[PDB]
Design an enzyme around this catalytic site. Structure first.
Site, PDB file in Angstrom:
ATOM      1  N   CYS A 126       0.815  -1.200   0.000  1.00 45.85           N
ATOM      2  CA  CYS A 126       0.000   0.000   0.000  1.00 45.85           C
ATOM      3  C   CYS A 126       0.863   1.271   0.000  1.00 45.85           C
ATOM      4  N   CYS A 129      -2.155   1.967  -2.401  1.00 46.77           N
ATOM      5  CA  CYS A 129      -3.101   3.037  -2.095  1.00 46.77           C
ATOM      6  C   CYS A 129      -2.470   4.426  -2.125  1.00 46.77           C
ATOM      7  N   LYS A 146      -1.223   5.404  -5.667  1.00 44.82           N
ATOM      8  CA  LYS A 146      -2.464   5.309  -6.434  1.00 44.82           C
ATOM      9  C   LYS A 146      -3.350   6.542  -6.218  1.00 44.82           C
ATOM     10  N   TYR A 200      -9.964  -3.294 -10.061  1.00 43.69           N
ATOM     11  CA  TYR A 200      -9.951  -1.907  -9.630  1.00 43.69           C
ATOM     12  C   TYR A 200      -8.568  -1.279  -9.832  1.00 43.69           C
ATOM     13  N   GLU A 228      -8.405   2.110 -12.154  1.00 41.13           N
ATOM     14  CA  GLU A 228      -7.816   3.221 -11.404  1.00 41.13           C
ATOM     15  C   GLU A 228      -6.644   3.859 -12.151  1.00 41.13           C
ATOM     16  N   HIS A 261     -26.929  19.858   3.986  1.00 38.93           N
ATOM     17  CA  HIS A 261     -27.083  20.452   2.681  1.00 38.93           C
ATOM     18  C   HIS A 261     -26.223  21.710   2.545  1.00 38.93           C
ATOM     19  N   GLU A 313     -26.077  13.424   1.300  1.00 39.79           N
ATOM     20  CA  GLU A 313     -27.433  13.561   1.840  1.00 39.79           C
ATOM     21  C   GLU A 313     -28.467  12.780   1.028  1.00 39.79           C
TER      22      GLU A 313
HETATM   23  C1  LIG Z   1     -26.341  32.775   3.843  1.00 37.87           C
HETATM   24  C2  LIG Z   1     -27.060  31.533   4.291  1.00 37.87           C
HETATM   25  C3  LIG Z   1     -26.477  30.282   4.118  1.00 37.87           C
HETATM   26  C4  LIG Z   1     -27.151  29.135   4.530  1.00 37.87           C
HETATM   27  N1  LIG Z   1     -26.561  27.901   4.342  1.00 37.87           N
HETATM   28  C5  LIG Z   1     -27.202  26.739   4.741  1.00 37.87           C
HETATM   29  C6  LIG Z   1     -26.585  25.502   4.547  1.00 37.87           C
HETATM   30  O1  LIG Z   1     -25.477  25.429   4.031  1.00 37.87           O
HETATM   31  N2  LIG Z   1     -27.212  24.342   4.937  1.00 37.87           N
HETATM   32  C7  LIG Z   1     -28.461  24.393   5.523  1.00 37.87           C
HETATM   33  O2  LIG Z   1     -28.992  23.329   5.861  1.00 37.87           O
HETATM   34  N3  LIG Z   1     -29.087  25.624   5.718  1.00 37.87           N
HETATM   35  C8  LIG Z   1     -28.468  26.806   5.330  1.00 37.87           C
HETATM   36  N4  LIG Z   1     -29.069  28.048   5.512  1.00 37.87           N
HETATM   37  C9  LIG Z   1     -30.418  28.144   6.162  1.00 37.87           C
HETATM   38  C10 LIG Z   1     -31.557  27.936   5.179  1.00 37.87           C
HETATM   39  O3  LIG Z   1     -31.551  28.927   4.168  1.00 37.87           O
HETATM   40  C11 LIG Z   1     -32.874  27.992   5.938  1.00 37.87           C
HETATM   41  O4  LIG Z   1     -32.784  27.153   7.069  1.00 37.87           O
HETATM   42  C12 LIG Z   1     -34.040  27.565   5.055  1.00 37.87           C
HETATM   43  O5  LIG Z   1     -34.083  28.378   3.900  1.00 37.87           O
HETATM   44  C13 LIG Z   1     -35.351  27.685   5.825  1.00 37.87           C
HETATM   45  O6  LIG Z   1     -36.433  27.478   4.955  1.00 37.87           O
HETATM   46  P1  LIG Z   1     -37.859  28.094   5.325  1.00 37.87           P
HETATM   47  O7  LIG Z   1     -38.915  27.564   4.381  1.00 37.87           O
HETATM   48  O8  LIG Z   1     -38.207  27.783   6.761  1.00 37.87           O
HETATM   49  O9  LIG Z   1     -37.679  29.670   5.065  1.00 37.87           O
HETATM   50  P2  LIG Z   1     -37.373  30.284   3.607  1.00 37.87           P
HETATM   51  O10 LIG Z   1     -36.587  29.343   2.738  1.00 37.87           O
HETATM   52  O11 LIG Z   1     -36.665  31.603   3.769  1.00 37.87           O
HETATM   53  O12 LIG Z   1     -38.819  30.577   2.973  1.00 37.87           O
HETATM   54  C14 LIG Z   1     -39.419  31.844   3.133  1.00 37.87           C
HETATM   55  C15 LIG Z   1     -39.900  32.384   1.796  1.00 37.87           C
HETATM   56  O13 LIG Z   1     -41.222  32.838   1.954  1.00 37.87           O
HETATM   57  C16 LIG Z   1     -41.356  34.158   1.456  1.00 37.87           C
HETATM   58  N5  LIG Z   1     -42.352  34.930   2.226  1.00 37.87           N
HETATM   59  C17 LIG Z   1     -42.157  35.672   3.367  1.00 37.87           C
HETATM   60  N6  LIG Z   1     -43.345  36.205   3.750  1.00 37.87           N
HETATM   61  C18 LIG Z   1     -44.296  35.811   2.868  1.00 37.87           C
HETATM   62  C19 LIG Z   1     -45.664  36.058   2.783  1.00 37.87           C
HETATM   63  N7  LIG Z   1     -46.186  37.044   3.497  1.00 37.87           N
HETATM   64  N8  LIG Z   1     -46.396  35.504   1.745  1.00 37.87           N
HETATM   65  C20 LIG Z   1     -45.779  34.705   0.796  1.00 37.87           C
HETATM   66  N9  LIG Z   1     -44.419  34.463   0.884  1.00 37.87           N
HETATM   67  C21 LIG Z   1     -43.687  35.007   1.902  1.00 37.87           C
HETATM   68  C22 LIG Z   1     -39.976  34.785   1.478  1.00 37.87           C
HETATM   69  O14 LIG Z   1     -39.846  35.705   0.415  1.00 37.87           O
HETATM   70  C23 LIG Z   1     -39.074  33.572   1.326  1.00 37.87           C
HETATM   71  O15 LIG Z   1     -38.738  33.389  -0.032  1.00 37.87           O
HETATM   72  C24 LIG Z   1     -28.411  29.215   5.121  1.00 37.87           C
HETATM   73  C25 LIG Z   1     -28.986  30.473   5.294  1.00 37.87           C
HETATM   74  C26 LIG Z   1     -28.317  31.621   4.874  1.00 37.87           C
HETATM   75  C27 LIG Z   1     -28.956  32.963   5.064  1.00 37.87           C
HETATM   76  C1  LIG Z   2      -2.152  -0.790  -6.955  1.00 45.56           C
HETATM   77  C2  LIG Z   2      -2.796  -1.164  -5.646  1.00 45.56           C
HETATM   78  C3  LIG Z   2      -3.663  -0.256  -5.057  1.00 45.56           C
HETATM   79  C4  LIG Z   2      -4.281  -0.547  -3.852  1.00 45.56           C
HETATM   80  N1  LIG Z   2      -5.120   0.385  -3.306  1.00 45.56           N
HETATM   81  C5  LIG Z   2      -5.759   0.141  -2.115  1.00 45.56           C
HETATM   82  C6  LIG Z   2      -6.608   1.115  -1.584  1.00 45.56           C
HETATM   83  O1  LIG Z   2      -6.796   2.189  -2.165  1.00 45.56           O
HETATM   84  N2  LIG Z   2      -7.248   0.867  -0.379  1.00 45.56           N
HETATM   85  C7  LIG Z   2      -7.060  -0.332   0.306  1.00 45.56           C
HETATM   86  O2  LIG Z   2      -7.668  -0.519   1.379  1.00 45.56           O
HETATM   87  N3  LIG Z   2      -6.193  -1.292  -0.231  1.00 45.56           N
HETATM   88  C8  LIG Z   2      -5.545  -1.070  -1.445  1.00 45.56           C
HETATM   89  N4  LIG Z   2      -4.690  -2.016  -2.002  1.00 45.56           N
HETATM   90  C9  LIG Z   2      -4.435  -3.337  -1.319  1.00 45.56           C
HETATM   91  C10 LIG Z   2      -3.374  -3.262  -0.213  1.00 45.56           C
HETATM   92  O3  LIG Z   2      -2.124  -2.885  -0.758  1.00 45.56           O
HETATM   93  C11 LIG Z   2      -3.224  -4.602   0.520  1.00 45.56           C
HETATM   94  O4  LIG Z   2      -4.476  -4.968   1.064  1.00 45.56           O
HETATM   95  C12 LIG Z   2      -2.150  -4.573   1.620  1.00 45.56           C
HETATM   96  O5  LIG Z   2      -0.880  -4.364   1.044  1.00 45.56           O
HETATM   97  C13 LIG Z   2      -2.080  -5.863   2.438  1.00 45.56           C
HETATM   98  O6  LIG Z   2      -0.914  -5.864   3.230  1.00 45.56           O
HETATM   99  P1  LIG Z   2      -0.109  -7.213   3.554  1.00 45.56           P
HETATM  100  O7  LIG Z   2       0.732  -6.979   4.790  1.00 45.56           O
HETATM  101  O8  LIG Z   2      -1.018  -8.419   3.642  1.00 45.56           O
HETATM  102  O9  LIG Z   2       0.836  -7.453   2.296  1.00 45.56           O
HETATM  103  P2  LIG Z   2       1.931  -6.378   1.852  1.00 45.56           P
HETATM  104  O10 LIG Z   2       1.544  -4.945   2.142  1.00 45.56           O
HETATM  105  O11 LIG Z   2       2.236  -6.638   0.389  1.00 45.56           O
HETATM  106  O12 LIG Z   2       3.187  -6.761   2.758  1.00 45.56           O
HETATM  107  C14 LIG Z   2       3.955  -7.890   2.447  1.00 45.56           C
HETATM  108  C15 LIG Z   2       5.417  -7.500   2.503  1.00 45.56           C
HETATM  109  O13 LIG Z   2       6.162  -8.637   2.858  1.00 45.56           O
HETATM  110  C16 LIG Z   2       7.250  -8.759   1.974  1.00 45.56           C
HETATM  111  N5  LIG Z   2       7.655 -10.171   1.844  1.00 45.56           N
HETATM  112  C17 LIG Z   2       7.141 -11.140   1.019  1.00 45.56           C
HETATM  113  N6  LIG Z   2       7.817 -12.295   1.236  1.00 45.56           N
HETATM  114  C18 LIG Z   2       8.750 -12.071   2.185  1.00 45.56           C
HETATM  115  C19 LIG Z   2       9.696 -12.899   2.769  1.00 45.56           C
HETATM  116  N7  LIG Z   2      10.173 -13.920   2.066  1.00 45.56           N
HETATM  117  N8  LIG Z   2      10.516 -12.358   3.733  1.00 45.56           N
HETATM  118  C20 LIG Z   2      10.410 -11.030   4.107  1.00 45.56           C
HETATM  119  N9  LIG Z   2       9.465 -10.220   3.518  1.00 45.56           N
HETATM  120  C21 LIG Z   2       8.656 -10.740   2.572  1.00 45.56           C
HETATM  121  C22 LIG Z   2       6.811  -8.124   0.666  1.00 45.56           C
HETATM  122  O14 LIG Z   2       7.902  -7.583  -0.043  1.00 45.56           O
HETATM  123  C23 LIG Z   2       5.888  -7.033   1.145  1.00 45.56           C
HETATM  124  O15 LIG Z   2       6.593  -5.824   1.298  1.00 45.56           O
HETATM  125  C24 LIG Z   2      -4.066  -1.752  -3.208  1.00 45.56           C
HETATM  126  C25 LIG Z   2      -3.201  -2.675  -3.792  1.00 45.56           C
HETATM  127  C26 LIG Z   2      -2.560  -2.386  -5.001  1.00 45.56           C
HETATM  128  C27 LIG Z   2      -1.643  -3.425  -5.579  1.00 45.56           C
END
Ligand SMILES: Cc1cc2nc3c(=O)[nH]c(=O)nc-3n(C[C@H](O)[C@H](O)[C@H](O)COP(=O)(O)OP(=O)(O)OC[C@H]3O[C@@H](n4cnc5c(N)ncnc54)[C@H](O)[C@@H]3O)c2cc1C
Ligand SMILES: Cc1cc2nc3c(=O)[nH]c(=O)nc-3n(C[C@H](O)[C@H](O)[C@H](O)COP(=O)(O)OP(=O)(O)OC[C@H]3O[C@@H](n4cnc5c(N)ncnc54)[C@H](O)[C@@H]3O)c2cc1C
Lengths: 588, 593
Positions: free
Chosen positions: A149, A154, A157, A291, A295, A566, A571
């Site tokens: 690895c 890994c 890779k 894989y 990859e 969100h 999600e």
């Molecule tokens: C900058 C910012 C970033 C945010 N980022 C995230 C985030 O990343 N992840 C997350 O989960 N939440 C986020 N939020 C929060 C999210 O926007 C609110 O939790 C969500 O929009 C609440 O939905 P709501 O329906 O309760 O209110 P709103 O979505 O605001 O619905 C109210 C709507 O009703 C309208 N309205 C108001 N009064 C009246 C009425 N008298 N008659 C008819 N329509 C009316 C308004 O114009 C408005 O469009 C963020 C908020 C802000 C301000």
């Molecule tokens: C290209 C590639 C990508 C991979 N990507 C992932 C990944 O993204 N995620 C993931 O979870 N797994 C990945 N794997 C798998 C991962 O590498 C193996 O699961 C892991 O190496 C298992 O470890 P091991 O100790 O059993 O064998 P190894 O890690 O191969 O260890 C064995 C070691 O013992 C040595 N050895 C052998 N015989 C002797 C001996 N005679 N005397 C002394 N030493 C000896 C070898 O030279 C070797 O260095 C990938 C494998 C490859 C080939």
């Protein structure tokens, strides 16, 4: 019940200390072994309801029943009184080190599972020896400590995946106001590899030192298992040796299979070679559909390369095929040419590699299609991603008798134990376990805790989530749709699915209805989420969190009740309503 | 009780059918209603645990026990034979249109919750009216259907946030081997806002069609709830009328507060104004410390701006304070200036907004510090983000008797019911509920179903995940640390934590040990995950998935059991071992090992 647990624990622990938090003598000794720099395993009897009958059952081992009771390798050594007696003369560092073998544990292989295991065992006392040898690839490539690895897996890779993703971030920048010309910008493979290699380079060291900082004896030696307790090591210049070990863990991993065809080993490269490669591969043929294959094909394409993938049958066998289809499609819709239903017959060299100029050769790939039609094209680089295999005939003398399965992998009970009671196997080589890095690490840590710290917990290998890191990522946890359908029948399986579009994509004028996710449930069981699948950006970041909820046996009702964050990609799982059976379109 | 329900379903649902999934004459009646384009709720008794009880209990409304049985607005309208009889004589479409009031539902507010509710009620055959009117800000800014989130909230917020992330991704490209200086590249704000507006444009239209598609009556009009069932309405040109509605949904949303200081309304802007501003803000002052304040400061900074933020007291009140500090310290270290412990006194115009050159003005911000020092700096534009107030005095005619709280927010029961029994309020206005989009949508849908579909499930408001979209994102789910101790006591609270570095950040040469995550748990209750917190990239994406496990009552044991996905940021949650009360440092030692 406890009779058998305690019988295995004391026998196998290197340096263990039975104790209470409620006993004053017990905490006083922990202070002493600390400033004496002794690493020991601490079983706390006041925090266990199997413990009521331990002090009574420690009469069979030391003829006493008072706490504390320090043991060293199955044999008793003494309580508060005898520990302090052995301390006031420097005799403690000499008594803990007393060993029937050279080492409490020898770990063959220094990869993900290997290193993880050795590091943990040492924490509870074991004088541990981790052996790692990297056998050169055909063309000559090698690397430092860390295993697959870290060096050729890994890590490179995904960094390369990252370079590739940034190709489209540059494109998108323009739409978001950034005044840069994407047409005029190019990629320097060479620069990138330096970056990647430099990080790997520092990881090789990180580990090397980490083992030093844990009294773990690291040897860059090729290990061979000659007998259930003896390992034969070869150094960087043929000096053969034979360190003895109490417990053996086989953690040797796999290497890339070459197809059995002329020119392959001579002119073709594997993933082992790709990540340290000096020159940009150029026109590339990837032969495979793992894989690994998609990859690599995927990030070479993103770095402005001419990429073809040769596919014998299907993409990502084992994975959910609806999702594999959508993966492949994305790639095809973005420049990855596919040679569908096609195998390689031979690889002939038209041009040699130019080192003095740092540029690839040219190679000819001869092959046939399924219907017998010929295939013939020139590629600068040929990459072979056709599965991996354990080469244990380099590590095991048959006369030790460790049972291997149909295709050369250690067959193990659930405690990572082999047919030979003191020998264990973890990671890629343990048959039937998912072949992933956290899986090996977890397998290794939990095994060290059972062996040298009297733990019960086993490694749970079920519903281990994955991410295929293709140009558009694919995250998965649980059963594929087709697998779910075979297990509990069609009428039982409901599939809630949907397409979606990342908000980041809107302004960027990218596809609608290409990102996609699905939940595969079992209605008879409350609508249990058997399987979760997602295709879109940061798929791994998306998936990881649900792997927990799935482990806990989540149902569709759980997902619905949970509120979305969100704006996020993830999600869309929380408000899924369109099923497949309803025939309703999953688009927006 | 099972009966108590039934009464509530028959009296409230616009058009409902009682059914069994196996009964052929139900299938026929279902199919017939689909062909005649009739929308209805359905209750399949054969899949209700109290099935034979409801069926026998139906006789009090229809006199029969058979299935199917069709009801319109509490009037039983017939059995299969009767409803088939009505279908080929074509009389059906008129029998579902028969209503005492103009609509089964008047939704006031065409925002997040309003639209969500509107569309949902409409699907079950409730006659529906969504009202939306956008009051222009002081400088005269307006937008289309959708609400805050769509036009001046989440959507433009994260789109601009994204643009700020691209900034650092241009630096990053270079390290990954791409040929660009990103030292000479500049950002054209005019291009970005075209794009951002272009999208909000298509969402305006999209949602408008969506309502029509579901036969929801969309009126671009100001809505006054004058009586329990009467809504007085003003269209585009002060022309007045009145419409009736059986049940009323209030989803009017809040609007941004202003400070009581001269120059504020005259020379300063709010977030409502920011996302359509045609000229680049220039040297900006942002007054506040809310997520809106920080997010807008964050991307403005990243977009090449000179940004100062004046904090009255603490960053992100309500949010886990350890996380708020780290969030801030990042921004400071990435060129965002903070006038701490500070409040504004007045604003004076020094130059007038060049509206023919696309250039800002120049404003004098006089202010005083917590101690006295008197703050006094110039800024090209000033942005107020001090919290958001409901304007219920603009919508809810006083004489109706709908209880507002200390803060002008509708007091509801946990089934969204206001003090007037037929009127409901949802979203930002439903007092003491987490003020978020996916909340306002969940509330709406679930409400609509309870009424017109006979569902029972309420909206769960506990453990709602958030993500502040600052330069380094902050995702959070559940109780903060200063609340977990505050409620369950220090001796019970065990906090696992860890710093981390994205593998992407290595080659790109960014900070080791600035990303941080923690799990606030409770020892006695099996180490129950009461809180999850993460500072780092894609925090939204990371957190979401866990909010599901947290819901089901997750223990640390559960995280431990779960295998990581490698390499990801999120995976660090699965191997957390370092605790606080044990003293070990969070810092990730090195490229590990
Ligand atoms: C900058 C910012 C970033 C945010 N980022 C995230 C985030 O990343 N992840 C997350 O989960 N939440 C986020 N939020 C929060 C999210 O926007 C609110 O939790 C969500 O929009 C609440 O939905 P709501 O329906 O309760 O209110 P709103 O979505 O605001 O619905 C109210 C709507 O009703 C309208 N309205 C108001 N009064 C009246 C009425 N008298 N008659 C008819 N329509 C009316 C308004 O114009 C408005 O469009 C963020 C908020 C802000 C301000
Ligand atoms: C290209 C590639 C990508 C991979 N990507 C992932 C990944 O993204 N995620 C993931 O979870 N797994 C990945 N794997 C798998 C991962 O590498 C193996 O699961 C892991 O190496 C298992 O470890 P091991 O100790 O059993 O064998 P190894 O890690 O191969 O260890 C064995 C070691 O013992 C040595 N050895 C052998 N015989 C002797 C001996 N005679 N005397 C002394 N030493 C000896 C070898 O030279 C070797 O260095 C990938 C494998 C490859 C080939």
């Amino acid at each position: 019940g406890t009779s058998q647990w305690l019988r295995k624990t004391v026998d196998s622990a290197a340096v263990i200390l039975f104790s209470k938090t409620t006993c004053p003598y017990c905490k006083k000794v922990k202070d002493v072994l600390a400033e004496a720099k002794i690493k020991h395993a601490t079983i706390e009897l006041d925090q266990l309801s199997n413990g009521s009958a331990i002090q009574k059952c420690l009469a069979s081992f030391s003829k006493i029943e008072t706490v504390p009771q320090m043991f060293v390798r199955g044999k008793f050594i003494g309580d508060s009184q005898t520990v302090l007696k052995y301390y006031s003369n420097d005799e403690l560092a000499g008594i803990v080190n007393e060993s029937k073998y050279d080492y409490d544990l020898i770990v063959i292989g220094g990869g993900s599972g290997g290193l993880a295991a050795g590091k943990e065992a040492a924490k509870y006392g074991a004088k541990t020896a981790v052996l790692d040898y990297v056998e050169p690839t055909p063309i000559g490539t090698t690397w430092g400590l860390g295993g697959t690895c870290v060096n050729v897996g890994c890590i490179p890779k995904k960094l390369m995946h990252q370079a590739g993703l940034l190709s489209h971030a540059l494109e998108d920048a323009e739409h978001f106001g950034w005044s840069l010309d994407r047409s005029k910008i190019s990629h320097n493979w060479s620069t990138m590899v330096e970056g990647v290699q430099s990080h790997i380079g520092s990881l090789n060291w990180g580990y090397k030192v980490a083992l030093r900082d844990n009294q773990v004896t690291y040897l860059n030696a090729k290990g061979r298992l000659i007998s259930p307790h003896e390992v034969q090591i070869t150094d960087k210049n043929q000096k053969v040796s034979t360190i003895t070990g109490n417990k053996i863990i086989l953690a040797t991993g796999e290497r890339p299979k070459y197809p059995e065809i002329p020119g392959a080993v001579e002119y073709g490269i594997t993933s082992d070679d790709l990540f340290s490669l000096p020159y940009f591969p150029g026109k590339t043929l990837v032969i495979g559909a793992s894989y690994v294959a998609l990859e690599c094909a995927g990030f070479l394409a993103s770095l402005g390369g001419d990429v073809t993938v040769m596919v014998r049958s299907i993409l990502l066998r084992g994975f959910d095929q609806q999702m594999a289809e959508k993966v492949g499609d994305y790639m095809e819709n973005h420049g990855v040419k596919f040679a569908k239903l096609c195998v390689p017959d031979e690889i002939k060299q038209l041009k040699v590699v130019d080192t003095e100029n740092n540029k690839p050769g040219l190679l000819l790939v001869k092959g046939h299609y399924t219907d017998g039609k010929k295939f013939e094209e020139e590629f600068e680089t040929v990459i072979f991603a056709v599965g991996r295999e354990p080469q244990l005939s380099k590590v095991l003398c048959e006369t030790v008798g460790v049972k291997l399965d149909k295709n050369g992998r250690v067959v193990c009970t659930d405690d990572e134990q082999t047919t030979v009671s003191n020998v264990y196997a973890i990671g890629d080589i343990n048959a039937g376990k998912p072949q992933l890095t956290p899986v090996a690490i977890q397998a290794g840590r939990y095994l060290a805790r059972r062996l040298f710290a009297g733990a019960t917990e086993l490694t749970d290998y079920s519903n281990v989530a994955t991410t295929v890191f293709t140009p558009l990522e694919y995250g998965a946890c649980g059963l594929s749709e087709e697998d779910a359908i075979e297990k509990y029948g069609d009428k039982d399986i409901e599939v809630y699915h949907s397409n979606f579009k990342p908000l980041e994509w809107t302004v960027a004028h990218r596809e609608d209805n290409v990102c996609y996710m699905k939940l595969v449930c079992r209605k008879s069981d409350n609508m249990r989420v058997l399987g979760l699948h997602v295709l879109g950006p940061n798929a791994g970041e998306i998936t990881q969190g649900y792997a927990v909820a799935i482990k806990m046996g989540a149902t569709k009702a759980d997902f619905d009740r949970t509120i979305g964050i969100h704006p996020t990609c993830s999600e869309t799982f929380t408000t899924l309503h369109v099923t497949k059976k309803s025939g309703v379109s999953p688009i927006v």
